From TrEMBL, chain B:
<feature type="binding site">
    <location>
        <position position="26"/>
    </location>
    <ligand>
        <name>Mg(2+) 1</name>
    </ligand>
</feature>
<feature type="binding site">
    <location>
        <position position="205"/>
    </location>
    <ligand>
        <name>Mg(2+) 2</name>
    </ligand>
</feature>
<feature type="binding site">
    <location>
        <position position="24"/>
    </location>
    <ligand>
        <name>Mg(2+) 1</name>
    </ligand>
</feature>
<comment type="similarity">
    <text>Belongs to the glycosyl hydrolase 2 family.</text>
</comment>
<feature type="binding site">
    <location>
        <position position="69"/>
    </location>
    <ligand>
        <name>Mg(2+) 1</name>
    </ligand>
</feature>
<feature type="binding site">
    <location>
        <begin position="145"/>
        <end position="148"/>
    </location>
    <ligand>
        <name>substrate</name>
    </ligand>
</feature>
<feature type="binding site">
    <location>
        <position position="209"/>
    </location>
    <ligand>
        <name>Na(+)</name>
    </ligand>
</feature>
<feature type="active site" description="Nucleophile">
    <location>
        <position position="145"/>
    </location>
</feature>
<feature type="active site" description="Proton donor">
    <location>
        <position position="69"/>
    </location>
</feature>
UniProtKB/TrEMBL annotation, chain C:
<protein>
    <recommendedName>
        <fullName>Beta-galactosidase</fullName>
    </recommendedName>
</protein>
<comment type="subunit">
    <text>Homotetramer.</text>
</comment>
<feature type="binding site">
    <location>
        <position position="90"/>
    </location>
    <ligand>
        <name>substrate</name>
    </ligand>
</feature>
<comment type="similarity">
    <text>Belongs to the glycosyl hydrolase 2 family.</text>
</comment>
Length: 1011, 211, 170
């Protein structure tokens, strides 16, 4: 029958979907949510055998184990075990597009298990098996007898084994197909893997059982009253003695309870549901659930006899909250939300797409610690535990159906085809039936990148009908179709319109006011954090805060989808697309996270944390104004610390407890600060600290900060006169200057300072020369490939213009001996094919104090693409342990991504000045620096800089960070100016005009001396 | 859906047609047990979508119907919207679940009386004049079935038409129905006679209600 | 598989639905709505045999005419021919309510037809068969080979027979 090549067959003999069950036989265990003896885990060691096609599977396998097969752990993806390669492709399907057909060579995974089953389980009741996740399709056998079939890799598939099991030992046979008609609906931008990657378990339910239950919570106008309504469905013989009791608990205190016999109210001419009953419990002054305060109650559903004999009990955590869109605003418990979200895939560098509690918790903690309050399940229902954690820790969730047909042409070719409605419907309906009772889920999503088809409209309405408590959204076909309650574009820019035909991405500010538009706007994806990115992140948040209907968005995305591989020496390294012989592939586009695969933060995470802060500040005179952006909670665990420093030197500090009501304001009067005698800029830094640990953070956690420049006293004092005069020595090839134990050498043929000596020890390995380029960032590259070049990408424009090929040509180089110094004047011109790209004019003044003042004035041809940077670079001979600087830090920061950084005196080990992006590029820059110290050298001025053991050339030529090798000495790049990094997206130029180096003429000066 | 030639004749002779999906689950309890079940959405979708794909070019068809007597289920709402999306040129109607649900553009009750209310629980049949003005109601009303012509009947037919002519929003209806479903049988003498339910040994049966 | 007791399978190998087609090869004939040589009616005398259940159908039937079958006119309802009784019930289902199962005793009508096809149709183009109405479900075989399955008694079910037809009789 080849059911895996027929969208008309998504399953065979599979049971109906439902909320999480455990079939407790003791109400107390159900209340406390302790393990259930009726729910067994079949996780562990299974038998596995890989085949090139299902037709290669031996029929003997159905009856007994294959001696060839190995013993592997389940859940798992077999690519992670080495049976075949994981494939990384973005849009293009990993198989030829010819629905519903798949490759004849269809990698087949044969899983089997021999396990025990107690007689008690077969004596009475129903015994079912549950596969939480099988990628992407599978047939099931139990003791040689065929059981069923199932598709949709991201939702549980259940089958009744009651008639197949025997008391004692039993054997399960699972044939998993890598490709199936379901694959056409699973084209998400991620690693394509396969296997039994989620839990497998056995569930025993009584014959008379609770087959389904839904919990709803309605409120009065001010949420001071609520009614919990629970609909319960049963299977088995109907009996007048049957009863259902729904009790609600807050801790060990029962707050409400309702009991009733089965028999719902009349719904139509034929009566009502005799097998259903709805319980309604009144709850006065309910404790409301939100990401701010995840208050939860426990609902226990007891199926029992009138006399009180318990048949079975199910339960769930209940969060009292109302989600609704009113007057164009998305409201939670009556208040307009501001979504500080992020998209999160289920990815592990070692286990692939197999999730574990430890990693889930790690992510949630990091997310909340970085001010995120929402997560989008990009782009499929997650492991069941995820929702439980979000319910308890407090995170708003967008539950999304496992449907993405990005690779089709047009994108909606399948979604607008009624032949595919059935398959699509199940991916939506079964998700809702499974997760509808989780309070963390506040919005349903119809899928991702599948254009807009009639099937979406039908399913949009289906959800609106079955569950009106949650808005429904979908970005496909333009982000504002008839299938979405929220304008949810991906990568729409703040002020810039992108008028694409049919599916334009309007500036978000402009989108809200288009004729007839009234919906709220929340980006489903924005700020593509690929590599050195997140430039312009602050622009989004300023807009979010100013526009009521701009209610946030979800950053793309949480964690790099890099996988671990090992070199000949057994050392692990991070791999991306194509590193497994997988082709075609999309290389590094699988890495777009705020954190590395091992959860170590990328520099961009701190910029996200700062912009997503819940406290806003304003300074006026001696008064600091604190405004709370919390909607429900008071600042009951916050202490404000303030510090005033003069060029890094602390002068005063203090702390004041924050006492701000949600949406409220608090004024803090700073004590008079004594004007310092010394010259310099006074800086005020404030930070919010959480004195008490929480469920998600440690005591002392910093949740927000802000800086302001206070009084500045410019230096007017003249430096002591020196009793020495540098001596100039001239030769045909050099201009040398001597002063004490210091010497400077300028090559007259190159026109650059080629060497500097301190006590006759060389300080340079490479001369000090101008640099106008940078090892391209992923944002500079875009989608441009060696074969398919994108002439519009910044890197291609720089290349075509000859910026990387351009060679300096000396125009002038003179030396003049002055009264108390030696003056070197130079001029260079960078040309490509007869075109003058840049002109650099400098003067080097070395005085009697040993200081060398460098003045640089550069001209950039108005018609050449704006350069990546305008500065100098050289390879210092020395390798020092620490880097000390007065400027923005301590983390890496760029022109359009420096709001999180603070001006102060920072000191870090040299290694921290290098950001290990899996795909190497310009990195580790620090801006707004007035002083830099490295070894015996000191540079002063107003510049940007990065310093490491890697040259821009090496970074530019190396595709993987593990292949980088420290070069001799230290490479220093000191920039007068540096271009923004961009990031609104990573496939088209995204650096805003204000961050491009288009001034034509630039000026900067530096003073180099010995500490 | 009818034999293809029927639409051709209606196009050429001139008759407004309500094309109806082959979906009726009258015997279920409650009536919407299957139509509110997502497991049955696929089967139902084909009966609606394939009808539209076949007859969408016939001018005689002016209204689409989601079926008959299957209560009101979520599947109806999903399919109502599917049609609205693929073919906005024709209103969509459905009587199940109260005749004025979210799955119908037209209040299309069956056997609702002119002046007399029939306050059935959950699915009342209001007087048609009263139905039009219920708080918030603005839709037109066209009975999908009225004046059950069983045997010596149609008493009070004039009452409907007087109301139809007086009230703008009462735009008529469809009498039930056109022709007796009697079948021919022959006696011992070979003489033909009209037979109804039960005359073929069929049991249980509903006798003369087929006429 | 018992596809007739599974609402998840409403058809197998059935072609997409569409508006009335006649595949004219002349614009003027299309304009006047005159007959099309590319659209043939198979209505007429067929071979029919009644069975109390699908399991009672002899496998030989797929390969050759059953000597016990009768020659009847199609289209038709076999109850009108007297093979079994028509049932009149209003609301109550004519079968036990137990979705998606139906009575084990399922009256089965085995129809068959031997026909010839134009030569040119076997060398080029696509030849499909169209059943405008089959109550209530059915399996299709052509020259002994299984073709498809279809449901919904009131809409046409179409299947491609291009790969099944042969020169001579089919
Ligand atoms: C490659 C772009 C044209 S499509 C773009 O690619 C990104 C890669 O991370 C993400 O998958 C986005 O969601 C997708 O729209
Ligand atoms: C610093 C807070 C956001 S942590 C927050 O405080 C709340 C009370 O205000 C509740 O205790 C929440 O459970 C807790 O996570
Ligand atoms: C049995 C009735 C209460 S239901 C009533 O029966 C009639 C019989 O002609 C028609 O079928 C109507 O449409 C139906 O609603
Ligand atoms: Mg299939
Ligand atoms: Mg995609
Ligand atoms: Mg009150
Ligand atoms: Mg700032
Ligand atoms: Mg079927
Ligand atoms: Na806003
Ligand atoms: Na990606
Ligand atoms: Na506090
Ligand atoms: Na590189
Ligand atoms: Na009227
Ligand atoms: Na009748």
């Amino acid at each position: 029958r080849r059911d895996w090549e027929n969208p008309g067959v998504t399953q065979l003999n599979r049971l109906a979907a439902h909320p999480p069950f455990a079939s407790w036989r003791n109400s107390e265990e159900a209340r406390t949510d302790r393990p259930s003896q009726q729910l067994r885990s079949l996780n562990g060691e299974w038998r596995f055998a890989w085949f090139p096609a299902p037709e290669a599977v031996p029929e003997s396998w159905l009856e007994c184990d294959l001696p060839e097969a190995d013993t592997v752990v389940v859940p798992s993806n077999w690519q992670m075990h080495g049976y075949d390669a994981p494939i990384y492709t973005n849009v293009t399907y990993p198989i030829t597009v010819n629905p519903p057909f798949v490759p004849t060579e269809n990698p087949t995974g044969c899983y089997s298990l021999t396990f025990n089953v107690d007689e008690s389980w077969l004596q009475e009741g129903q015994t079912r098996i549950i596969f939480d996740g099988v990628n992407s399709a599978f047939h099931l056998w139990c003791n040689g007898r065929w059981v069923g079939y199932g598709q949709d890799s991201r939702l549980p598939s259940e089958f009744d084994l009651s008639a197949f099991l025997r008391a004692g030992e039993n054997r399960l046979a699972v044939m998993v197909l890598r490709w199936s008609d379901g694959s056409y609906l699973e084209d998400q931008d991620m690693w394509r893997m396969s296997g039994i990657f989620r839990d497998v378990s056995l569930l025993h339910k009584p014959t008379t059982q609770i087959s389904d239950f839904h919990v709803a919570t309605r409120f009065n106008d001010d949420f001071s009253r609520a009614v919990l309504e629970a609909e319960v469905q049963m299977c088995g013989e109907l009996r007048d003695y049957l009863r259902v009791t729904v009790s609600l608990w807050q801790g060990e205190t029962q707050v409400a309870s309702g009991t009733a016999p089965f028999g719902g109210e009349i719904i139509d001419e034929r009566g009502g549901y005799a097998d259903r009953v709805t319980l309604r419990l009144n709850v006065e002054n309910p404790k409301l659930w939100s990401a701010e305060i995840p208050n939860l109650y426990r609902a226990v559903v007891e199926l029992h006899t009138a006399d009180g004999t318990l048949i079975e009990a199910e339960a769930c955590d209940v969060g009292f909250r109302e989600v609704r869109i009113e007057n164009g605003l998305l409201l939670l418990n009556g208040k307009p939300l501001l979504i500080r979200g992020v998209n999160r895939h289920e990815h592990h560098p070692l286990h692939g797409q197999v999730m574990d509690e430890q990693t889930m918790v790690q992510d949630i903690l990091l997310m909340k610690q970085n001010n995120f309050n929402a997560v989008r399940c990009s782009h499929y229902p997650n492991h069941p535990l995820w929702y439980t954690l979000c319910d308890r820790y407090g995170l708003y969730v967008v539950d999304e159906a496992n449907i993405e047909t990005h690779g089709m042409v047009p994108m909606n070719r399948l979604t607008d085809d009624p032949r595919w409605l059935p398959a699509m419907s199940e991916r939506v309906t079964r998700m809702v039936q499974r997760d509808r009772n989780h309070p963390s889920v506040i919005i349903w999503s119809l899928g991702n990148e599948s254009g807009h088809g009639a099937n979406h409209d039908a399913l949009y309405r289906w959800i609106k009908s079955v569950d009106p408590s949650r808005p429904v959204q979908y970005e496909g076909g333009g982000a504002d179709t008839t299938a979405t309650d929220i304008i949810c574009p991906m990568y729409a820019r703040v002020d810039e319109d992108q008028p694409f035909p049919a599916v334009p991405k309007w500036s978000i500010k402009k989108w809200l006011s288009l004729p007839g538009e009234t919906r709220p706007l929340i980006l489903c994806e924005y700020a593509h954090a690929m590599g050195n990115s997140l430039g312009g992140f602050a622009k989004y948040w300023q807009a979010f805060r100013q526009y009521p209907r701009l209610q946030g968005g979800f950053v793309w995305d949480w964690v790099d989808q890099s996988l671990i591989k090992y070199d000949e020496n057994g050392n692990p390294w991070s791999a991306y697309g194509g590193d497994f012989g997988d082709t075609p592939n999309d290389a590094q586009f699988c890495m777009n996270g705020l954190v590395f695969a091992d959860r170590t933060p990328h520099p961009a995470l701190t910029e996200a944390k700062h912009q997503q802060q819940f406290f806003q500040f304003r300074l006026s005179g001696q008064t600091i104004e604190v405004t709370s952006e919390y909607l429900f909670r008071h600042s009951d665990n916050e202490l404000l610390h303030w510090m005033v420093a003069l060029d890094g030197k602390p002068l005063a500090s203090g702390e004041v407890p924050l006492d701000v009501a949600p949406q409220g304001k608090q004024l803090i009067e700073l004590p008079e600060l004594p004007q310092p005698e010394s010259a310099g800029q006074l800086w005020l830094t404030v930070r919010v600290v959480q004195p008490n640990a929480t469920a998600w953070s440690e005591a002392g956690h910093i949740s927000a900060w802000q800086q302001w420049r206070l009084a500045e006293n410019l230096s007017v004092t003249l430096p002591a006169a020196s009793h020495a005069i540098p001596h100039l020595t001239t030769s045909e090839m050099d201009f040398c200057i001597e002063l004490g134990n210091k010497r400077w050498q300028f090559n007259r043929q190159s026109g650059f300072l080629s060497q500097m000596w301190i006590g006759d020890k060389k300080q340079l390995l490479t001369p000090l020369r101008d640099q106008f380029t940078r090892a391209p960032l992923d944002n500079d590259i875009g989608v441009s490939e060696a074969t398919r070049i994108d002439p519009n990408a910044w890197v291609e424009r720089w290349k075509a213009a000859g910026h990387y090929q351009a060679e300096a040509a000396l125009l002038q180089c003179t030396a003049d001996t002055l009264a108390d110094a030696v003056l070197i004047t130079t001029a260079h011109a960078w040309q490509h094919q007869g075109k003058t790209l840049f002109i650099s004019r400098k003067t080097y003044r070395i005085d009697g104090s040993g200081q060398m003042a460098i003045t640089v004035d550069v001209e950039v041809a108005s018609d050449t693409p704006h350069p990546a940077r305008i500065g100098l670079n050289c390879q210092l001979a020395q390798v020092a342990e620490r880097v000390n600087w007065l400027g923005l830090g301590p983390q890496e920061n760029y022109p359009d991504r420096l709001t999180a950084a603070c001006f102060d005196r920072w000191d870090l080990p040299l290694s921290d000045m290098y950001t290990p992006y899996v795909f190497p590029s310009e990195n580790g820059l620090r801006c707004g620096t007035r002083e830099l110290n490295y070894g015996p050298h000191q540079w002063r001025g107003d510049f940007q800089f990065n310093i490491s053991r890697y040259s821009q050339q090496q970074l530019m030529e190396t595709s993987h960070r593990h292949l980088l090798h420290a070069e001799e000495g230290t490479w220093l790049n000191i920039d007068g100016f540096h271009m923004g990094i961009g990031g609104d997206d990573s496939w088209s130029p995204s650096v805003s005009a204000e961050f491009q180096l288009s001034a034509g003429r630039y000026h900067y000066q530096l003073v180099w001396c010995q500490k």
